[PDB]
Amino acid sequence: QFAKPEDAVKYRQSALTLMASHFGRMAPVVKGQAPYDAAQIKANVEVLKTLTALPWAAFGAGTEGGDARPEIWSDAAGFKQKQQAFQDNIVKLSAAADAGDLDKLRAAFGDVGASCKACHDSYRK
Numbered sequence: 500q501f502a503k504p505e506d507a508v509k510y511r512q513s514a515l516t517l518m519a520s521h522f523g524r525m526a527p528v529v530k531g532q533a534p535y536d537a538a539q540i541k542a543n544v545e546v547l548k549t550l551t552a553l554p555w556a557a558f559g560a561g562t563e564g565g566d567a568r569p570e571i572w573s574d575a576a577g578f579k580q581k582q583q584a585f586q587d588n589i590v591k592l593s594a595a596a597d598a599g600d601l602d603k604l605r606a607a608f609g610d611v612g613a614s615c616k617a618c619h620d621s622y623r624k
């Protein structure tokens with residue numbers, strides 16, 4: 500869907516940005532600093548879940564640029580793995596949310612977060 504590499508870059512960064520917001524916004528709740536409303540959380544996770552599938556398609560060959568390390572392309576299999584483990588954690592998050600269990604959510608939240616970090620460690624400049 501992209502004409503220039505710059506456009507894929509702009510797209511993926513935007514998706515990542517949005518996702519960061521949707522995920523990050525739950526930290527105070529998960530930490531107990533904000534009240535917990537199951538329904539609100541559930542809806543937010545639904546959005547997050549949609550957003551989380553988006554970025555991956557904008558890292559095709561020829562989209563080199565931004566803060567993407569070249570290893571994303573040299574080591575595609577490793578990148579796919581990182582991405583899949585991440586989506587899997589999203590699924591867990593989603594299940595915790597659906598169930599309305601703060602403990603579960605809290606734990607899953609940590610798992611997801613570690614997933615973000617794992618990817619960044621190997622593939623983000």
Ligand code: HEC
Nearest residue numbers: 512515516519522565566567581582585614615618622623
């Ligand atoms: C690999 C599969 C990743 C996972 C999982 C997550 N992120 Fe990441 N992120 C990744 C890369 C390769 C990049 C650089 C993209 C580029 O082309 O510049 C990023 C970047 C971000 C950003 C910056 C967006 C911007 O404004 O430029 C943010 C805010 C970000 N990542 C956050 C983020 C969060 C919160 C994640 C988990 C919920 C997460 N990322 C996972 C690679 C990967």
